[PDB]
Design a protein around this ligand. Structure first.
Ligand SMILES: [Mg+2]
Lengths: 413, 287, 130, 182, 337
RNA sequence: GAGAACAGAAAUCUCCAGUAGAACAAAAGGGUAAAAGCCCCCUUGAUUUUGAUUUUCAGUGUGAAUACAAACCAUGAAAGU
RNA sequence: GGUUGCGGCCAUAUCUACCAGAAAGCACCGUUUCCCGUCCGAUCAACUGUAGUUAAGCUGGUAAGAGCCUGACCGAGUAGUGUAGUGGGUGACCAUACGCGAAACUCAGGUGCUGCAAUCU
C-alpha cells in the first residue's frame, strides 16, 4: 500500500512547539453495517422503506416473489407472491395502507401490509413492462378515499388507476417512447419523463388533458423529480411516526407539510428537474414558464439519478463519471462535486435531516456524504457485488440496500 | 519449538522496544501497610506488571547480583523492592536496568501520612489508560536527583508510546510536586506523589469548545523521602541514549515527489564585456 | 535469438554488444545508460507503456498502462530485462475497471498475464488475473 | 470558572508523553505537612496544570478516516484522535542495540565475486516426467523421492543417500557453530 | 509458471483516505523554478484526475438517429431539429450570419495563372528525420537536457513542441535553459531575458569561448550540483540541444577549456553527436540543431535565424530588405560604413 | 486406596483421592494450573510495497535479498492471538 | 444484615468431622419438541418451573484440630560485616566508631475484608 509520505523532520520539530491555542430535529448519521438477510435467489432491483416506520421495508428483485422485511429483526415478513415475472419496481402508498409494485410483466399487484396478500385482481392493460409508479398525494385526496396510483410502461402510455375499483380511470398516449418515470405533484399537474427526448406536464383535473410540452434536452429525459416529492411521498408521516387520529387530520397535516415547503420563497411554486443522457440537467417551473430556469451542466457522463433535498434547498444527481455533483435548489447553481466512487453511480437518497446523502454506485462499496461539509462522511463496504439500490428511512433510524449479491443489507448509526 | 522463539523475540533489543515490565519484590521486612502501598502502585502499572509471593532478603546497595538475576529470569527490567528497617522505615528502593544490568537506584521511603486508594471517592478509573503527568517546581528540570526521579516516574507510568491517542482516554492525571523550594546544599525536600481523576464541564467563558477542568483526588497518596542513590556510569549513559538510526538539497515533496533543488546563486552580469563590434564604436560616422 | 549481435567500430570483430529483439517494459525512469557502458539494448520502438489487458469478468477489455514485470519464466533474468514473450505476468493499473476489495480500500492495481506474442504484433494483450 | 490560565514562567510542554512541567516557585508554607489545607493548594495547582495541558492537547490536529466496518486496527469514522507529537523527553534504552552482526564468512566472499542473492521466488519447482509440481522444500520433497522409488539400479543405496543428506546437514550445523564462535 | 495465491494475489490496494488526501494536495503542487523532480511516486492518477468543469461535450446524437433516419432513401427526419421559435429571430440570425460571412470574406496570384516557384530544399533543414533521431537519442541518453537560446532572440530560438515532449514522456528531465552569446547583445537585454525566462527555467547566462569567458564557473557549479543530486545514478549525462549555430559545440569547448568539438560559423558543422567527459562524473553531449517545422516558419525568418546557409539561396538579394527591419540604421551606417 | 470373566505384582474398565517428580526442544533457574500437557475442527505465507544498508555496471523511480512499518491471511461470537 | 452477576487483594481466603440456614436469590432437580455432541441427553445444547429438597454444592458456627498471616521501641540497632591507626605482636588477629544490618526465638492478636447493579422481612 502507498502510505501517505512521513512528515518531514522539520514538520515534527514544528509540531513539538505549542500551537493553535485560542484564548480569545436531527438524524444520526449511519456509520455501521448489520447482519445480512438471506432471501429470494435473485438480485435486488429496488427498495423502499415504509413511510410510517423504518421497521417495515420491501424490495423487488429478479425473483417474481417480492419480500417484505422486518428491519427490526432483519428477517423476512409475509413474502409477497402472485407475479410471474421480475418485480421491476416497488412503492408504498403515502397513507401506508396499501403497497404497490410494478412487475416486468404487464400485471400490477397491490398488496396489504398487514398480511401481504394481494389486494384484489392484478392491474392490467399495459403493453410492456412497468417503468415507474407514483401514488397520488394525500393532501390532494379528499378524506375517506384511497389515493390514486399512477403507472407507466415502456410503451410510453400512462394509466391513472382507481385503487378501490382496480380500474384505469384515465389513460394517455402522448409519449412516442418509453416513460422513464412519472410523478404526481402536489399542484394537481402531473409530470413525467420520456425516452422521446420530451416532457409533457399533464392536468389530471381536466380529464387528463395535456397543457404543456417541454423541449430542451438533447437526449432522452431520465428520472424526472420535483422539490415537493419528499413531502408527497412521506404522506404527512413526520419523523416521530405517529399516525393521525382521523383521515381528515391526515389531510390537514399533509396540506400543512406541503405548504411548508411549497412556500419557501413566499409563493406556492414547486421546482422541477429532469435528468438527461446529454450530460445536462434543467430546472423547470412549468406553471411559470415553458423554458428552463437554468441549464445545469458539467458531468462527464450521463446522469443516472436526481433527488431534490427534503427542504428543497439543494439539488443533486448521480452520474456515470463517478462524481456526484451538488447544485442549488433555488436556481441550480453549482455548489460542489463529490468524488471517491470508483465506478458509475446509480442512485442516491437524501437524509430526512437534509444534512446527509446516502449514495451507491457500481462499485461494491456504497457511501454516504455529509453535504454540510461537502465531503465524504463514512464509507460503507460489505456488499459482495454492485449496490443496485439504496434508500433511507423517513425517520432516519436505518438504511437499506440491495445488489447483485442476492444479500439484502441494512445500515444504521 | 516455535513458542520458545516468541519468548526469545520478547527478550530482544527491538528497535522499538515494548513497554518495560514491572516486577515488585516484597521484602522480608516489608510491613503489611507497605504491601498495601505496593499493590496500590501496582494497580496503576497494569497490565504490564508482575508479582512474587515469596519473601526476599534482597540488599540492592550491598549486592546487586540477585536483582540482575531476577530481572533476566522474569524479563522485567524495572523493579521496586519493598524494604523496611529500624532506620529506613517503609523503604521503597525503585530500580531500573539496561540489558538487565543495573542502571540506577534511589530510595523513596513512604511518609506515615500515606492514604490508600480505598480512602477516597469511588470514581470510575478505567484500567490501561495512559496517565497524564504534571510535574511542578524548577528543581525537577535542574536537580540531577529530581531529574532522575522524573525520568523514572515517566518510564514507569508513561505506558505505550502511541503515535495517536483518544481524548476519551484522558480519564486521570498523575501529579507530583516537591515540598517547596530549597537553597543549594540543603537536604532534598520530600517528593509528593499525587493522582487525580479528571472532570469536565461547559465553560461558556473560555471558548466554544474548551471545557472547564476539575480534579478529584483518588490516590494512592504518598510523600516519598529521598535516601541512598546510585547513577549509571557515563558509558552506560551513552549506550542507553543512542538512537536506532534506522540528504542535502533533497526532500520528500507533498504527494511523494522527491523534488530536488539547485539553489543557484547570485551572478552579476557586469563582469562580462560585450564584443567591441565595429558598428558600436563612435570612431566611425557619416554625414 | 533474443540477442542480436550488434557490431561497431571500423573493424567489426569483437562487437562487444547484444540487443533484445522483442518488446520490453523499460520503466518510467529509464534514462538511457551511456553508450560506452551500453551492452544490452532495448530499442524504443519495441518498448510499450501500455497493454490491452482484458478482464474475464463481465467480458470487458480495456487498454491500461503497464506497471511492472513480476515473474517471467524461462530465465527470469528476462524479467529483469522486462521481456513479456507470451506468458509473462505483469502488474497493471486496474483502477479503471472499478475493482474494490472488501473493507473499502479501493484497488488500483492487479496482476495480468500477457498472451499474444509481442514480436508478431505491436499490441500487448493480456488476460486479467481475477 | 474561566479555562484561561497563565504563569510568569510559561509551562513546559511534552505532548507526546502527555506530560507537563512547571518551573514556577512553589509556596513552602502551603506545602507544609502540618497544614490541613496542604492538599487543597496542591489540588488547585494540579487542576491548573491539567487545564493548561487540556488547552494544549485539544489544539492538536486530529486524524480522520472514512473506514468503519472491517477495519483491522483503523479508528472509527465517528471517532477522532489527537496527533501526538513524538516525545521530547529522552529516556534510557531498555536493552543495547543488536549490533552484534557477523558476515558469517560468506557475505564477504559474495562481495568478492559475482554471486547474487537467491531469487526467493518460491520453493516450488516442476517435477520431471510428472503432471504435478513437487516442491523442493517445505513439503514432500523430490530429493527424498529417491528413497521412495521402487528401484535404484544400484548396502542399500537409499541408506547412502540418507547418509549424504545427514552429512550435508551436519556440515551446515558445523558452519553455523563456527560462525557462532566469532 | 507454478500456481500461487500471488497472481490472483492483491498487490497495490490503497485506502480511500489516501486518495482524498492526494486530491486535497493536488492544489499544492506549484513548484519553484529552482525545484527539480527526481522521482515521481506511483499513484492512481486516473482517480485524482477529472478536475471540476462545466463544458459537458456534445451528446451522442448517433444513438437516437445514427445515419438512416437522418438522411437517405428512408429519410425519416421529416422536420428540422430545434424548431426555431420565431420568424423574427430567424431573420435576425440570418442577418447576423450574413454579416459574419461578409466580415470573413473581408479578411481576403492565381488570377494571372502563375504559381509560386518551388521552395529550395536548403530551407527544409533540419528535416529528414536524421537530426531529429539524433536529438531523441541524445535526449534519452542525457540525464539532464539543457536548451541553449540565442541572446539576440531567445523567443525565436525556442524549440517549441519538443519541450512539451520532454515534460510529458520524460518528466524527470530538467531541461534547464541556457542563454549564450550575451556579448552580442546589450547586457541589460540579457538581464531582462533571464528575468523573463527565470519564471520557468534557470536560464543561466553564458558566453562560450576557449579564451576568457563569462559564466563558465556558474555552469560548472550547476552541473556539479546536478551530479550531486544523482549520486545513486553513478553519473549524470548532459546533452546540448537548440537551434543550429547556437554555439552548443562552442559552449562544450568552453566547459572543457579546449577545442574539443569542431566549431564553425556554418550551422551544419555538427555532423553527428560525440561523447565528452569532464571530472569523470558527467558526460557532455551535443546534437545537430533542431528546427521544429511549422506553417509560421516564415522562410525568410528561418534565414534571419541562421538555420539556413546563405550560399545556397537562389535569391540572396531579395532577403536584403528584411535585415533593415531588425538592425538599427545607425549601426549599419557605422559599420559598413 | 477399593476394586473388574479369564486377568494375578505388571492387560484393559470403574469410584474416591493430586500444587501437578503431567510434558512445557532445554542449561544454570525463576516458572507454566479451564495450560505452554492430552483429545477434537479450519487453514497457508518463500504474498504485495516504504524506506536505510548490501554489489551490480543497461545502477534501473528498484532489477534482487537483509531490517523497518502498512495491507493481505487463519481462527473465534468476540476480546485478541 | 442474607443473597445473584462481575471483580480487587490472592490460604485471616485452604483441608478434616458435625450443627444451623426464618424470608429472599443460585443449585439439586423433571423432560428430549426444537438448535446441538458425546459409546452413554453423564458433561455439553435446548424445553417450563411443572411433581419436590433444603439431602448435597453453597453461607455461617463449633475444634487444647493441621497450615497461614499481622505488629512489638521482640531478638535489635544485637549477631554478622567494610573502616582507621604498629594502639599489642614476627604476625594472624584483639579492644576503640560511625555505617549496611538479619534470622531462629519471645510476647499479643486473627482464621477474611472490600467496589458496582440488583434483590430480600
Ligand atoms: Mg555552427
Amino acid at each position: 500500500s502507498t502510505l501517505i509520505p512521513p512528515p518531514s523532520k522539520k514538520q515534527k520539530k514544528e509540531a513539538q512547539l505549542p500551537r493553535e491555542v485560542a484564548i480569545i430535529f436531527k438524524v444520526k448519521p449511519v456509520t455501521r453495517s448489520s447482519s445480512a438477510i438471506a432471501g429470494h435467489g435473485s438480485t435486488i432491483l429496488c427498495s423502499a422503506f415504509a413511510p410510517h416506520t423504518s421497521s417495515r421495508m420491501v424490495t423487488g428483485a429478479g425473483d417474481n416473489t417480492a419480500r417484505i422485511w422486518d428491519c427490526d429483526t432483519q428477517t423476512p415478513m409475509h413474502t409477497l407472491k402472485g407475479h410471474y415475472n421480475w418485480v421491476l419496481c416497488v412503492s408504498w402508498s403515502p397513507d401506508g395502507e396499501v403497497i404497490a409494485t410494478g412487475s416486468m410483466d404487464n400485471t400490477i399487484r397491490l398488496w396489504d401490509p398487514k398480511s401481504g396478500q394481494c389486494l384484489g385482481d392484478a392491474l392490467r392493460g399495459h403493453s410492456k413492462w412497468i417503468t415507474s409508479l407514483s401514488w397520488e398525494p394525500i393532501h390532494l385526496v379528499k378524506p375517506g378515499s384511497k389515493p390514486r396510483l399512477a403507472s407507466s410502461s415502456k410503451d410510453g402510455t400512462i394509466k391513472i388507476w382507481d385503487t378501490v375499483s382496480r380500474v384505469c380511470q384515465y389513460t394517455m398516449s402522448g409519449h412516442t417512447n418509453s416513460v422513464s418515470c412519472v410523478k404526481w405533484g402536489g399542484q394537481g399537474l402531473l409530470y413525467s419523463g420520456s425516452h422521446d427526448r420530451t416532457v409533457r406536464v399533464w392536468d389530471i383535473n381536466s380529464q387528463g388533458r395535456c397543457i404543456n410540452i417541454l423541449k430542451s434536452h438533447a437526449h432522452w429525459v431520465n428520472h424526472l423529480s420535483l422539490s415537493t416529492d419528499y413531502a408527497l411521498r412521506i404522506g404527512a408521516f413526520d419523523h416521530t411516526g405517529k399516525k393521525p387520529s382521523t383521515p381528515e387530520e391526515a389531510q390537514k397535516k399533509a396540506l400543512e407539510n406541503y405548504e411548508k415547503i411549497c412556500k419557501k420563497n413566499g409563493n406556492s411554486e414547486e421546482m422541477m428537474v429532469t435528468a438527461s443522457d446529454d450530460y445536462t440537467m434543467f430546472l423547470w417551473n412549468p406553471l411559470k414558464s415553458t423554458k428552463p430556469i437554468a441549464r445545469m451542466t458539467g458531468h462527464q457522463k450521463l446522469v443516472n439519478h436526481v433527488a431534490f433535498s427534503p427542504d428543497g434547498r439543494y439539488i443533486v444527481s448521480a452520474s456515470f463519471d463517478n462524481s456526484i455533483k451538488l447544485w442549488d435548489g433555488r436556481d441550480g447553481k453549482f455548489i460542489s462535486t463529490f468524488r471517491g466512487h470508483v465506478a458509475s453511480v446509480y442512485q442516491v437518497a437524501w437524509s430526512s435531516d437534509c444534512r446527509l446523502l446516502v449514495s451507491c454506485s457500481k462499485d461494491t462499496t456504497l457511501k454516504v456524504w455529509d453535504v454540510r461539509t461537502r465531503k465524504l462522511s463514512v464509507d460503507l463496504p460489505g456488499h459482495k457485488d454492485e449496490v443496485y439500490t439504496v434508500d433511507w428511512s423517513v425517520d432516519g433510524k436505518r438504511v437499506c440496500s440491495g445488489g447483485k449479491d442476492k444479500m439484502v443489507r441494512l445500515w444504521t448509526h | 519449538n516455535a513458542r520458545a522463539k516468541r519468548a526469545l523475540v520478547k527478550r530482544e533489543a527491538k528497535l522499538v522496544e515494548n513497554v518495560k515490565q514491572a516486577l515488585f519484590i516484597p521484602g522480608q521486612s516489608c510491613n503489611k501497610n507497605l504491601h498495601d502501598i505496593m499493590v496500590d502502585l501496582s494497580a496503576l502499572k497494569k497490565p504490564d506488571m508482575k508479582r512474587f509471593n515469596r519473601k526476599n532478603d534482597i540488599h540492592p546497595f550491598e549486592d546487586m547480583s540477585p536483582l540482575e538475576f531476577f530481572s533476566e529470569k522474569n524479563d522485567c527490567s524495572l523493579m521496586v523492592l519493598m524494604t523496611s528497617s529500624k532506620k529506613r522505615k517503609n523503604n521503597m528502593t525503585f530500580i531500573r536496568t539496561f540489558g538487565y544490568k543495573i542502571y540506577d537506584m534511589i530510595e523513596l521511603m513512604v511518609a506515615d501520612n500515606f492514604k490508600l486508594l480505598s480512602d477516597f471517592k469511588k470514581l470510575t478509573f478505567t484500567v490501561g489508560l495512559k496517565p497524564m503527568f504534571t510535574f511542578q517546581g524548577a528543581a525537577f528540570d535542574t536537580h540531577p536527583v529530581y531529574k532522575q526521579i522524573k525520568s523514572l516516574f515517566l518510564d514507569f507510568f508513561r505506558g505505550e508510546s502511541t503515535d495517536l491517542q483518544d481524548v476519551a482516554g484522558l480519564q486521570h492525571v498523575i501529579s507530583m510536586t516537591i515540598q517547596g523550594d530549597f537553597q543549594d546544599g540543603e537536604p532534598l525536600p520530600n517528593v509528593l506523589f499525587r493522582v487525580y481523576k479528571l472532570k469536565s464541564y461547559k465553560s461558556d467563558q473560555g471558548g466554544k469548545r474548551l471545557p472547564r477542568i476539575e480534579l478529584v483526588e483518588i490516590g494512592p497518596r504518598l510523600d516519598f523521602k529521598i535516601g541512598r542513590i546510585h547513577t549509571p556510569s557515563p558509558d552506560m549513559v551513552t549506550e542507553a541514549h543512542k538512537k536506532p538510526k534506522q540528504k542535502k538539497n533533497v526532500e520528500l515533496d507533498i504527494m511523494g515527489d522527491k523534488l530536488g533543488r539547485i539553489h543557484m546563486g547570485k551572478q552579476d552580469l557586469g563582469k562580462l564585456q560585450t564584443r567591441k563590434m565595429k558598428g558600436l564604436k563612435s570612431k566611425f560616422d557619416q554625414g | 535469438e533474443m540477442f542480436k549481435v550488434i557490431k561497431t567500430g571500423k573493424s567489426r570483430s569483437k562487437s562487444w554488444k547484444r540487443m533484445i529483439t522483442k518488446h520490453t517494459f523499460v520503466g518510467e525512469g529509464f534514462t538511457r545508460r551511456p553508450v560506452k557502458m551500453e551492452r544490452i539494448i532495448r530499442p524504443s520502438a519495441l518498448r510499450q507503456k501500455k497493454a490491452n489487458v482484458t478482464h474475464p469478468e463481465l467480458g470487458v477489455t480495456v487498454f491500461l498502462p503497464i506497471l511492472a514485470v513480476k515473474k517471467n519464466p524461462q530465465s527470469p533474468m528476462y524479467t529483469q530485462l522486462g521481456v513479456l514473450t507470451k506468458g509473462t505476468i505483469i502488474e497493471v493499473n486496474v483502477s479503471e475497471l472499478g475493482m474494490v476489495t472488501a473493507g473499502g480500500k479501493v484497488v488500483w492495481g492487479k496482476y495480468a498475464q500477457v498472451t499474444n506474442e509481442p514480436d508478431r504484433d505491436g499490441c500487448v494483450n493480456a488476460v486479467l488475473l481475477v | 470558572l474561566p479555562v484561561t490560565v497563565e504563569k510568569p514562567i510559561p509551562v513546559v510542554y511534552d505532548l507526546g508523553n502527555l506530560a507537563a512541567f512547571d518551573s514556577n516557585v512553589l509556596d513552602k508554607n502551603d506545602l507544609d505537612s502540618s497544614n490541613a489545607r496542604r492538599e487543597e493548594k496542591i489540588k488547585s495547582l494540579t487542576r491548573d496544570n491539567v487545564q493548561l495541558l487540556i488547552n494544549q492537547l485539544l489544539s492538536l490536529p486530529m486524524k480522520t478516516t472514512t473506514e468503519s466496518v472491517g477495519g483491522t486496527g483503523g479508528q472509527s469514522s465517528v471517532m477522532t484522535l489527537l496527533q501526538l507529537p513524538d516525545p521530547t523527553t529522552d529516556l534510557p534504552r531498555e536493552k543495547p542495540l543488536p549490533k552484534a552482526k557477523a558476515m558469517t564468512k560468506w557475505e564477504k566472499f559474495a562481495a568478492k565475486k559475482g554471486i547474487k542473492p537467491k531469487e526467493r521466488a518460491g520453493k516450488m519447482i516442476y517435477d520431471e516426467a510428472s503432471g504435478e509440481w513437487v516442491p523442493k522444500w517445505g513439503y514432500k520433497g523430490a530429493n527424498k523421492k529417491l528413497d521412495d522409488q521402487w528401484l535404484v539400479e544400484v548396502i542399500d543405496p537409499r541408506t547412502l543417500n540418507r547418509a549424504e543428506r545427514k552429512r550435508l546437514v551436519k556440515k551446515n550445523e558445523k558452519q553455523q557453530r563456527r560462525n557462532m564462535k566469532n | 509458471v507454478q500456481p500461487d495465491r500471488r497472481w490472483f494475489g492483491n498487490t497495490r490496494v490503497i485506502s480511500q483516505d489516501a486518495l482524498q488526501h492526494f486530491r486535497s494536495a493536488l492544489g499544492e503542487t506549484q513548484k519553484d523554478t529552482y525545484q527539480v523532480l527526481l522521482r515521481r511516486n506511483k499513484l492512481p492518477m486516473s482517480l485524482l484526475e477529472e478536475k471540476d468543469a462545466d463544458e459537458s461535450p456534445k451528446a451522442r446524437i448517433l444513438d437516437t438517429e445514427s445515419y438512416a433516419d437522418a438522411f437517405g432513401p428512408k429519410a425519416q427526419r421529416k422536420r428540422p431539429r430545434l424548431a426555431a421559435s420565431n420568424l423574427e429571430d430567424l431573420v435576425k440570425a440570418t442577418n447576423e450570419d450574413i454579416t459574419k460571412y461578409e466580415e470573413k470574406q473581408v479578411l481576403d496570384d492565381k488570377e494571372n495563372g502563375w504559381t509560386s516557384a518551388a521552395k529550395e530544399a536548403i530551407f527544409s533543414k533540419g528535416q529528414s528525420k536524421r537530426i531529429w533521431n539524433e536529438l531523441y537519442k541524445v535526449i534519452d541518453s542525457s540525464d539532464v537536457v539543457i536548451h541553449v537560446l540565442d541572446a539576440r532572440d531567445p523567443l525565436g530560438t525556442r524549440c517549441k513542441s519538443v519541450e512539451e515532449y520532454m515534460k510529458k514522456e520524460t518528466p524527470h528531465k530538467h531541461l534547464i535553459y541556457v542563454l549564450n552569446k550575451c556579448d552580442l547583445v546589450p547586457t541589460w537585454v540579457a538581464a531582462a531575458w533571464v528575468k523573463h525566462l527565470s519564471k520557468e527555467r534557470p536560464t543561466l547566462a553564458f558566453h562560450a569561448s576557449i579564451t576568457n569567458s563569462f559564466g563558465k564557473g556558474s555552469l560548472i557549479q550547476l552541473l556539479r550540483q546536478f551530479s550531486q543530486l544523482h549520486t545513486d545514478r553513478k553519473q549524470i549525462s548532459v546533452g546540448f540541444i537548440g537551434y543550429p549555430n547556437t554555439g552548443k559545440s562552442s559552449i562544450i569547448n568552453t566547459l572543457r577549456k579546449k577545442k574539443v568539438c569542431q566549431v564553425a560559423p556554418i550551422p551544419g558543422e555538427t555532423k553527428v553527436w560525440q561523447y565528452i567527459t569532464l571530472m569523470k562524473r558527467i558526460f557532455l553531449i551535443d546534437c545537430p540543431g533542431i528546427v521544429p517545422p511549422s506553417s509560421k516558419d516564415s522562410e525568410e525568418d528561418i534565414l534571419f535565424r541562421g538555420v539556413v546557409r546563405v550560399e545556397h539561396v537562389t535569391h540572396p538579394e531579395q532577403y536584403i530588405p528584411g535585415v533593415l527591419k531588425r538592425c538599427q540604421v545607425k549601426h549599419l551606417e557605422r559599420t559598413y560604413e
